[model samples]
Target: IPRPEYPRPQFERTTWVNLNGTWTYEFDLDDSGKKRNLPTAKELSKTITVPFCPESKLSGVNHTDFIKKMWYQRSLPIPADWSNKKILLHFGAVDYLAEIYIDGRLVGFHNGGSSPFVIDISRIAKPGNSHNLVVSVSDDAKSGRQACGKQSPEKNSFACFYTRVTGIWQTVWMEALSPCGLKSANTYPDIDNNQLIITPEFYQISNDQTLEVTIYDSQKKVAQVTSKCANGSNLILPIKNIKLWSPETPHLYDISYCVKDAKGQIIDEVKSYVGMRKVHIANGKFYLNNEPYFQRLVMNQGYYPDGIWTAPTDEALKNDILLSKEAGFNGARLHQKFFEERFHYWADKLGFITWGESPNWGMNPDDEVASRNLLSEWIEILERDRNHPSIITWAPLTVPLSGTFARLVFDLQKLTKAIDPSRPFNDLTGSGFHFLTDIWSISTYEPDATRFALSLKPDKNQAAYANQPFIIGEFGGIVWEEDALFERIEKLINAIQSSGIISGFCYTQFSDIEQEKNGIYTYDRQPKFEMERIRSIFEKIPSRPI
Candidate 1:
């Protein structure tokens, strides 16, 4: 219930701007919102809250049924204090196609619905100026390549299928930025050599400038390095015996990088940081903080009874982390979805490892030719979320990755290794079989206990125990009546623990939705299991390289 700042860990400013309360909404069946002017009707307007989607409880709409497309409009004058500075607009997330008009001028068009998008009204107009801004979102859950996670397009839904999440979700806020300041800076840390890679990318990469990097160990200064702003060269930073970061002690170091113009005046300044750590498969055991560590993890689907994909409140965001901690998990395998930046922020701050997975294209990929395109989509996903300190593993397995999707799995393994050398990549995990992976992840239960035992013996035996890490990507998916879920899931958990084949275990989920009641909690913040007892049982397990 105690929600913190909404914008979360990435702090360019500390103000709320008060835009999350209420708005006017209208749903359209056609693609009218993507083109020019939105349909204007004084009588067609229905009241809904800002930030929450039309189908959410916090939005004050709470329509469980799908409503095709949606339109939202809200007008607010810029805060008086930010009058002198130019305002940069931000949308935490929207479902599908998004069109924005500022002062009735079409300025932004975003094709992605799940990712964050920003618009700089700073140069377009003065701050504190009242402007009529309208946003329209089109999300046909059954339509297009956009990721939808577990929601299936159907009228009768249960099990894996659930209600459709249409239109704008998450938060919408604005900020003021100087004309020339840090547009964005990516922070990458290399723990093997005790160095942090600093890259200051510009919008246009023009204007000859020098980039200065300052490393801070806590509040104390370490070493300072400067280099000519390389248009596209990797900037290597050297450190001395850095403290490797891990879930137990997620140490963070401060980095202040500034790019000054030709005249020696600071044009851009950004503050960011990275953890010094390495995660790889060495001696066939999962290595972290330079040694073997068992991942006592859980499967976390970013869903809510109230908001589904969009978390209801910032407290909703923090509660997901806080509750995970209480559940005695060191991390979570975020299966079948892309988590927002705010979720990663808590994982980083709370010191829990995270795995990022793209929603699979589904089984028997009839469109086998689309594998390359899918790979490109996977790479794009990597580019969008690579800089986070919390993410530790990328899934090698996907839904459509059945027998036909096998050959491409090899390519995916290679691509995953090529993109990230720090963390171990899955060869792909799931019911569909695969062998070549840095980590071995299995989902379903064998008929009996013996088959699960056979899977444990290292098959490759290449270097040290086949040099492969083992993980229960998903297990304990016990289906019972909603109220009896706790006891049923407990049996499955006990079975896996006694089997000893699973070095890491990620439960079916934190909460159940629609008909999935295996979760310890309901979709809303209601407990179905004995949370404290579950934590104690999990804590008793040998979590360190067992």
Candidate 2:
């Protein structure tokens, strides 16, 4: 039941503990649990498996009912090895709002469902030994201003909206860090320039600190660089005989980072990986590593029947990518919900391309509270995932139809491009006239191939902006009827292939989710049609260059 793998491999430290299995839990139905001294309470009658939501069968609770509030408590002995190191407690994610406490001391609070947050427990933990840890979470998925995505607020499942996720839906673990620890590494592989750009932020920097970065190709060291902390620890490491990363090769380079003090002693170390690939738009076409790459994308909502918001196992995450690849999709638009970091890890390792998206449904950007929540949470998501080479586009707001939400969308675009400037930003997919979009895309459900082709054509009434690289992202949500599914999909593919101006296309979805049974695969990930047949539809070469 424990999620044993390191939750965050992109920026990792060696000394850590997996606090993932068996925790005393309770639902605060009446909102009265806090006043009952629950944080310091020695024991609780009920237990549940962690990294799985209560509504999930894997969680041992299987409480399909609404859980507005919940509490989790566990204890662990303070390792003697951690005495000289700073203790950090990390949560992979919590649904909406999470409050942390240690030894009855309120340490900190975070308010994002899909972003990870860490608490420095160095000062608050029990000084003696084994201490108690408590987490109180409140997830008002329906009424809250935060982005709800596909998690249904309704009591019953309907259309695209499915089950609600409440409380810690990801792993919770602990790490031991030095007083001055490396915080994050934001990396971009520049195949055009034949170098890697790595910018790292730190918890704190010592007076005479220097940063060392070593790059490895499998078991052999490839390149290494060192910079003074005063140089901002930003290294433009050059690579000779650069191996470009793509779905075909999926090659990756291991990276090791070290922090050395004035005496030239390594004070801290971490491990990470990166791929050498470039994604950009030129001459009205998308290019991957300087070659025109037509994307065969599938819409992945990141849902599971047994685990709901979380995957049943880590291998399950890897398998989802492999299955999508087998289905002939070079990538996926990770729809709604910030798919966990581990998902990105596999995408990087497997050479699967993905468009990082926030499930921004039911979010009113016009509302003051909603806008703040959306912007802040979005920044976190972008920062967290920007380093992944598999992620080439950031779909922060999808299908934001109304003009009322335009300002929010515009602000997001500016912020995103300014921050990364390496990847394109799809301001809105299948959305009305957009501003500040790098590429144009349309979402069409027109079942007729002829009509679909016409819809994708540029017109004064075009939903997608004209004169840009175009991709039909949300098309072919054809309902399974009288078993003409295969024929219908083939015809749709034919139309997309005939569109001389279209640069890429993504089918409605990879699998059926809830009542929206429009996926090529069923909810359980079984193919709804012949595997080769599906692959051949997308795997074919474009009839004309985009």
Candidate 3:
């Protein structure tokens, strides 16, 4: 049972089953599985571990070469007790394109590689019965038709790109739900108003149904509200004594939702939590909870030596946050990948801030299909992660700028604001042509401290939007050279603090990847230098205010 923990802790139900283990798999080298009706086959020729991509070492079928087409087959037996409920087949993510079939019948199709998707299997498979579940996947990381992000398009891992991941990179599970259950609930923390607004979406609603929301502080109930079960209804729960969530004290309120019918019968219920926090850019600085704050972030590319894009276990996800905090950084820029929801859950619990970024690399911005795929997947990413309080910013593009790229960036910014306007948006991280953005970010790797200080001058042409918050989104990517590395890092940190114009900074990376040797920690999570030495350099307080 790899990754046995609940895949989504934020919106969790008590009745669910873990569907991660060994599964039969076969590769369609010519992409002709559909023509041969592979979905109806009883079993595949080879066996691979569930939730781990075929190209990864942990999958048992470590075929690291390009996987254009593949098929996965497994047996799913629904519990007899869930006979009256709707059965759901959940995939944390399937790279590129995926088509699901139950008992040889097509049930669902999804295109995004990094976002979660679900299919209702009630009609295809009933409870107390074992059914064959088949998943067909097609990935073209080299085609530039979709967002692949850091996945190598060539035959070998080179520069920053690593081995590719194809099919079922995240967890797969099953859950039972009522016919009219709650689909999603987005939480918005209103620090200024001292209240939390919740908008819940339901799978289906009846005129006689009512939604009950209760907020708890540890064991004591703080706020409760009941409203008619209507689509897009806002349920405001005002707090009496607000305990703001910050890096020092990451306070979280327990939340519960219950759907009751006119007869006072509970049809559905869910348990969740939320943190009370707010973020904005003002006075040329980033403000958290109405006070100017400095952000010390690390570039965290969510990759594992064995799991590739997936973490080996639930503790592994939480350990990443603990490791980052142990190094004295307050947050991370989830670079090149849209991390799993459980990662965000740990960040929320630990009070680690993060900038939500899209895996927009390995795609040509000028390609219409690539741009469309990115936009659609990004929307799903926001909808899935907007509830987490740990995320303070949204970055859709890494370094896109000018002409068609600028138009795409502009559209992404507009869509981000329209979807989740609570957080600031960084149109482009690092140096790029910015058409519309809330924060101006730049990336520099100047090895010399004196020269690095000169490059970050406020009047420099690269630093546009002087009035808005300016940040060194990326810097200090020095290779692991021991003595010289720490000295350069310390000088770079001091230079950024003394500049008085930069709001925050994100160091090059938290750990080294295959060919990239600039991380403070090695690929296996071992520190290159003394942990204290690195901490002291990053945890220093700024000498001048913005």
Q: Which prediction has the highest TM-score against the true structure?
A: 3
Candidate 2 residue spans exceeding 4 A from truth: 126-128, 400-404, 459-466, 481-483, 542-546
Worst 10 residues of 2 by lDDT: 457-466
Best candidate (score: lDDT): 3
- Pairwise TM-score winner, candidates 2 and 3: 3
Candidate lDDT (C-alpha), each: 0.67, 0.82, 0.86
**Tens-digit per-residue lDDT, 302-363, candidate 2:** 99999998988889899999999888888899998899899999999997889988868867
Ranking by TM-score: 3, 2, 1
- Window of ten residues with lowest summed lDDT in model 3: 457-466
lDDT by residue (52-104, candidate 1, tens digit) is 67666766787777676777777747776665454678776676678887766
TM-score of 3: 0.97
Residue-level error in angstroms, candidate 3, position 405: 1.4
Q: Rank the candidates by lDDT, best first.
A: 3, 2, 1
- Cα deviation of 243 in candidate 3 (Å)? 0.9
Q: When superposed on Cα atoms, how far off is each prediction in RMSD? A: 4.3, 2.2, 1.8
